[PDB]
Design an enzyme around this catalytic site. Structure first.
Site, PDB file in Angstrom:
ATOM      1  N   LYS A 249      -7.231  -0.705  -7.283  1.00 18.94           N
ATOM      2  CA  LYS A 249      -7.965   0.277  -6.807  1.00 18.94           C
ATOM      3  C   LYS A 249      -7.854   1.703  -7.146  1.00 18.94           C
ATOM      4  CE  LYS A 249      -9.964  -0.371  -2.651  1.00 18.94           C
ATOM      5  NZ  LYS A 249     -10.473   0.023  -1.473  1.00 18.94           N
TER       6      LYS A 249
ATOM      7  N   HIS B 216      -6.569  16.170   2.410  1.00 15.36           N
ATOM      8  CA  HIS B 216      -6.098  16.078   1.088  1.00 15.36           C
ATOM      9  C   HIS B 216      -5.634  17.412   0.554  1.00 15.36           C
ATOM     10  CE1 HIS B 216      -8.671  12.369   1.329  1.00 15.36           C
ATOM     11  NE2 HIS B 216      -7.749  12.126   0.216  1.00 15.36           N
TER      12      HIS B 216
ATOM     13  N   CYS C 206      -4.544  12.110  -2.628  1.00 17.84           N
ATOM     14  CA  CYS C 206      -3.261  12.190  -1.441  1.00 17.84           C
ATOM     15  C   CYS C 206      -2.266  11.235  -1.696  1.00 17.84           C
ATOM     16  CB  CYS C 206      -4.064  11.706  -0.112  1.00 17.84           C
ATOM     17  SG  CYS C 206      -4.455  10.117   0.016  1.00 17.84           S
ATOM     18  N   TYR C 207      -2.408  10.190  -2.921  1.00 19.46           N
ATOM     19  CA  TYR C 207      -1.301   9.257  -3.134  1.00 19.46           C
ATOM     20  C   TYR C 207      -0.401  10.067  -4.126  1.00 19.46           C
ATOM     21  CZ  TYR C 207      -3.948   5.988  -0.971  1.00 19.46           C
ATOM     22  OH  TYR C 207      -5.048   4.967  -0.116  1.00 19.46           O
TER      23      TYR C 207
ATOM     24  N   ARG D 249      -3.206   1.314  -4.077  1.00 15.93           N
ATOM     25  CA  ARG D 249      -2.847  -0.314  -4.348  1.00 15.93           C
ATOM     26  C   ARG D 249      -3.229  -0.661  -5.621  1.00 15.93           C
ATOM     27  NH1 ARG D 249      -6.740  -3.148   0.140  1.00 15.93           N
ATOM     28  NH2 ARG D 249      -8.076  -0.890   0.761  1.00 15.93           N
TER      29      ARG D 249
ATOM     30  N   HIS E   7       1.015  -1.188  -0.244  1.00 14.89           N
ATOM     31  CA  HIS E   7       0.145  -0.185   0.122  1.00 14.89           C
ATOM     32  C   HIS E   7       0.965   1.342  -0.266  1.00 14.89           C
ATOM     33  CE1 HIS E   7      -3.039   3.129   1.126  1.00 14.89           C
ATOM     34  NE2 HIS E   7      -3.969   1.971   0.565  1.00 14.89           N
TER      35      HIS E   7
ATOM     36  N   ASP F 284      -6.540   8.735  -6.322  1.00 18.49           N
ATOM     37  CA  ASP F 284      -6.872   9.620  -4.951  1.00 18.49           C
ATOM     38  C   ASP F 284      -5.675  10.552  -4.911  1.00 18.49           C
ATOM     39  OD1 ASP F 284      -7.663   8.885  -1.462  1.00 18.49           O
ATOM     40  OD2 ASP F 284      -6.906  10.667  -2.446  1.00 18.49           O
TER      41      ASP F 284
ATOM     42  N   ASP G 295      -9.830  14.292  -2.717  1.00 18.17           N
ATOM     43  CA  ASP G 295      -9.303  13.069  -3.207  1.00 18.17           C
ATOM     44  C   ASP G 295      -9.645  12.668  -4.725  1.00 18.17           C
ATOM     45  OD1 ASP G 295      -9.838  10.212  -4.043  1.00 18.17           O
ATOM     46  OD2 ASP G 295     -11.032   9.708  -2.322  1.00 18.17           O
TER      47      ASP G 295
ATOM     48  N   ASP H 296     -11.031  18.694   2.401  1.00 21.68           N
ATOM     49  CA  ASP H 296     -10.661  18.412   3.770  1.00 21.68           C
ATOM     50  C   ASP H 296      -9.109  18.848   3.758  1.00 21.68           C
ATOM     51  OD1 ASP H 296      -9.089  15.966   3.675  1.00 21.68           O
ATOM     52  OD2 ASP H 296     -10.691  15.115   2.861  1.00 21.68           O
TER      53      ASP H 296
END
Ligand SMILES: COC(=O)CN([C@H]1Cc2cc(-c3ccccc3)ccc2N(Cc2cncn2C)C1)S(=O)(=O)c1cn(C)cn1
Ligand SMILES: CC(C)=CCC/C(C)=C/CC/C(C)=C/CONC(=O)CP(=O)(O)O
Ligand SMILES: OC[C@H]1O[C@@](CO)(O[C@H]2O[C@H](CO)[C@@H](O)[C@H](O)[C@H]2O)[C@@H](O)[C@@H]1O
Ligand SMILES: [Zn+2]
EC number: 2.5.1.58
Lengths: 315, 410
Positions: B280, B348, B285-286, B277, B234, B283, B338, B345
């Site tokens: 999936k 993020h 934040c990645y 991962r 992850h 997003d 995201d 938020d």
């Protein structure tokens, strides 16, 4: 006793059985920052929680109070820790506590504290009997819940519950063959049982995976598992695999197949293959195809691989 | 070439359509969800193209600034779920401001210091709010927030003697750390511990014994790193694992080949952002947890004398990541998110901006190369890829604390 949203719920400040203890307000300082303007209900519970915590009151009333504090913020690890101190101090029935955590996790399955609490209970009871079925229920609702998988691995390893897990993996791969969590569980089961050194097991796994790739050729997880189970011995140690993929190339020239060929060639060159110059030329041609056409998002990676191959194998 | 007022984009090229999901006519929950995201994102990309006119992309700095500035004082009861994460709110907000080059007023800085002092436990470390037990996650956040402030007042808040005792109190015989007393173990704790211990100069020979080996056990067959040994790779845990090993100078404990191949595979061909991962969803934040692995890997490989490393670019698509963040992850009311359809938020906001800065700035040795997509004003302040605070702040804090002894240890 009474839940936080029950019509008959009463604030702790209004409860006769709590009258003897003064609540402890949170001191945020004279000039607060990131100051949360709590609801009356939230502040009331946490004011009494701070009071019991400060006094280290190990009571049935404090125990019930933690249930409300948890409903208000189940990520409060201080409350969870205190609840466990009380479970022990009060010699609470742990099977009743298991029923509680079961309900809580069902409501909030994406939370570290609730899973950890469950693990502590199973450790204390040395009773894994409800675990696989419960986790399977959570996974029925979200098949990739990371905490659920992690808890499942722990239970299986700790209590040696390996016997039916490959069958469970198979069922979930039938439901969604793209579920990477399940391919990961497949590796976890096999490596910890038979291992992959048994050549009969390895053959079974290679065939199974190639079959999945044939059914769904653009599913990355199966490609990744194929590489994962062969990589430590070295992809070049499997000469028949290269031919099989090369036979598939014209009709199924996906970025995954093409990348796998480069990976094989990389390893071949590292192991003094015959026809080194030919293999190097083929590898560099494929890196360029990937960088420019088939896998352009990874242009920088493929260009690096090309330069890396030349630095190691050019002569 | 192009007039200054039009800038062609990777996600808008005609051939970009070929990058849409191929489901092989086999529908599963995974492919259905991926396709829904791709359809939404294509609609977004298209809204930025006017045939051959492609206006420069704009980071809405002023809207983000106002959103952040308001979050630093009082929050509604909607934030009750973060009542055990208040130092995180401080860190996410202060770091976002820092990236945006927005000064922290003296009074705000002092108020933050005072509040973090209240979250500091007498046993060492920081809790999620005043009177909470200490936990390595808000300990990491509080220390980072204090180093962003970077005043002697901020540095001196930290009780270093108790912090070191607290880390010892969490250390397991197998090299791992508990996140808190009586709490769970995962790779986040190793990073939180390594980060705070290196910044504050409290590392003993003893403290991280076995930790590098335990982290290496968390690298799996995929090449990334899971939360604990056996678990699925992850991005969040991979960042933590590699960053902790960089601090410990033990990166070579990992297979860097399989790690590099795994992380670069996490960039989404269509969306341009990263997934956490395999199989999936993308997003924002990645943009940090995944893309931040590339400067770490660059440093690691460079330390090994790798003659093939680029002298100008990270090994991911810097432009496509900037396109995903700028077109898909900005809330028009300020803040970042995201993916389209999600709520803004502060978390993020913090990590989308951190990832944007990584994507804009390459540095290695004396070589510096910037790629700032859109209007020049989009350029953010650089971030340190290990600590995720400004490199200036890292140097200033580390220099300050190196002047103090390791507590009770000569
Ligand atoms: C530094 O890294 C983090 O804190 C990631 N954390 C959460 C944080 C988070 C915060 C917010 C937020 C922040 C401020 C105001 C309102 C909301 C939203 C979501 C958060 N996390 C969930 C997440 C992020 N990206 C995808 N997902 C599912 C992931 S986390 O506490 O480690 C976490 C807790 N869990 C149960 C899973 N991840
Ligand atoms: C220093 C800290 C606290 C770093 C945090 C690192 C992260 C982001 C870790 C991830 C932890 C985790 C429980 C991931 C699983 O998230 N589950 C999801 O469904 C999100 P996705 O679908 O993107 O995996
Ligand atoms: O990514 C493979 C790389 O990870 C290491 C650990 O650094 O081992 C992991 O992967 C193996 C399968 O390739 C597993 O057997 C092992 O348990 C896991 O830690 C390296 O050994 C390997 O090259
Ligand atoms: Zn996210």
């Amino acid at each position: 006793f009474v839940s936080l949203d029950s019509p008959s719920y009463v604030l702790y400040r209004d409860r006769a059985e709590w009258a003897d203890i003064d609540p402890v307000p949170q001191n945020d300082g004279p000039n607060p920052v990131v100051q949360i303007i709590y609801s009356d209900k939230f502040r009331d519970v946490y004011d009494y929680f701070r009071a019991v915590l400060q006094r280290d009151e190990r009571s049935e009333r404090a125990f019930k109070l933690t249930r409300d504090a948890i409903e208000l913020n189940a990520a409060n690890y201080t409350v969870w820790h205190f609840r466990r101190v009380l479970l022990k101090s009060l010699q609470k029935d742990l099977h009743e506590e298991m029923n509680y955590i079961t309900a809580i996790i069902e409501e909030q399955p994406k939370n570290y504290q609730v899973w950890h609490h469950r693990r502590v209970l199973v450790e204390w009871l040395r009773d894994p009997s409800q675990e696989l079925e419960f986790i399977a229920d959570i996974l029925n609702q979200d098949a990739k819940n990371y905490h659920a998988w992690q808890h499942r691995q722990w239970v299986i390893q700790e209590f040696k519950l390996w016997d039916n897990e490959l069958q469970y993996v198979d069922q979930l791969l039938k439901e969604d063959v793209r579920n990477n969590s399940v391919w990961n569980q497949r590796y976890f089961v096999i490596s910890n049982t038979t291992g992959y050194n048994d050549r009969a097991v390895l053959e079974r796994e290679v065939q199974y995976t190639l079959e999945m790739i044939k059914l769904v050729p653009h599913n990355e997880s199966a490609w990744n598992y194929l590489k994962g189970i062969l990589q430590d011995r070295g992809l070049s140690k499997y000469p028949n695999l290269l031919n099989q993929l090369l036979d598939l190339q014209p009709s199924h020239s996906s970025p995954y197949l093409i990348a796998f060929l480069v990976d094989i060639y990389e390893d071949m060159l590292e192991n003094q293959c015959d026809n080194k110059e030919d293999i190097l030329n083929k590898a560099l041609e494929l890196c360029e195809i990937l960088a420019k056409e088939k896998d352009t998002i990874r242009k920088e990676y493929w260009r690096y691989i090309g330069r890396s191959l030349q630095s190691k194998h050019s002569t | 070439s192009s007039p200054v007022w039009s800038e062609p984009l990777y996600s808008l090229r005609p051939e970009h359509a070929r990058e849409r999901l191929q489901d092989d006519s086999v529908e599963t929950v995974t492919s259905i969800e991926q396709a829904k995201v791709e359809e939404k994102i294509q609609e977004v990309f298209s809204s930025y193209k006017f045939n051959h006119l492609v206006p420069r992309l704009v980071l809405q700095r002023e809207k983000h600034f106002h959103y952040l500035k308001r979050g630093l004082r009082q929050l509604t009861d909607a934030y009750e779920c973060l009542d055990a994460s208040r130092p995180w709110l401080c860190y996410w907000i202060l770091h976002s401001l820092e990236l945006l080059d927005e000064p922290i007023p003296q009074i705000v800085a002092t108020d933050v210091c005072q509040f973090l002092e209240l979250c500091q436990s007498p046993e060492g470390g920081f809790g999620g709010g005043p009177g909470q037990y200490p936990h390595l996650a808000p300990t990491y956040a509080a220390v980072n927030a204090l180093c962003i402030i970077g005043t002697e007042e901020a540095y001196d808040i930290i009780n270093r003697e108790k912090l070191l005792q607290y880390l010892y109190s969490l250390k397991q015989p197998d090299g791992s750390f508990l996140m808190h007393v009586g709490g769970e173990v995962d790779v986040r704790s190793a990073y939180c511990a390594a980060s705070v211990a290196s910044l504050t100069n409290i590392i003993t020979p003893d403290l991280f014994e076995g930790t590098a080996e335990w982290i290496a056990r968390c690298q799996n067959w995929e090449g990334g790193i899971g939360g604990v040994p056996g678990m699925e790779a992850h991005g969040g845990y991979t960042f933590c694992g590699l960053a902790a090993l960089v601090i410990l100078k033990r990166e070579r404990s990992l297979n860097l080949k399989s790690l590099l191949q795994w992380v670069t595979s996490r960039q989404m061909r269509f969306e341009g952002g990263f997934q956490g991962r395999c199989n999936k969803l993308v997003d924002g934040c990645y943009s940090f947890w995944q893309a931040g692995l590339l400067p770490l890997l660059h440093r690691a490989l460079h330390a090994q004398g790798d003659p093939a490393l680029s002298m100008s670019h990270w090994m991911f698509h810097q432009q496509a990541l900037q396109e995903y963040i700028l077109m898909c992850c900005q809330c028009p009311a300020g803040g970042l998110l995201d993916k389209p359809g999600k709520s803004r938020d502060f978390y993020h906001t913090c990590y989308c901006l951190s990832g944007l800065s990584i994507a804009q700035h390459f540095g290695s040795g004396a070589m510096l190369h910037d790629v700032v997509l859109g209007v020049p004003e989009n350029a953010l302040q650089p971030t340190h890829p290990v600590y995720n605070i400004g490199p200036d702040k890292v140097i200033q804090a580390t220099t300050y604390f190196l002047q103090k002894p390791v507590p009770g240890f000569e």
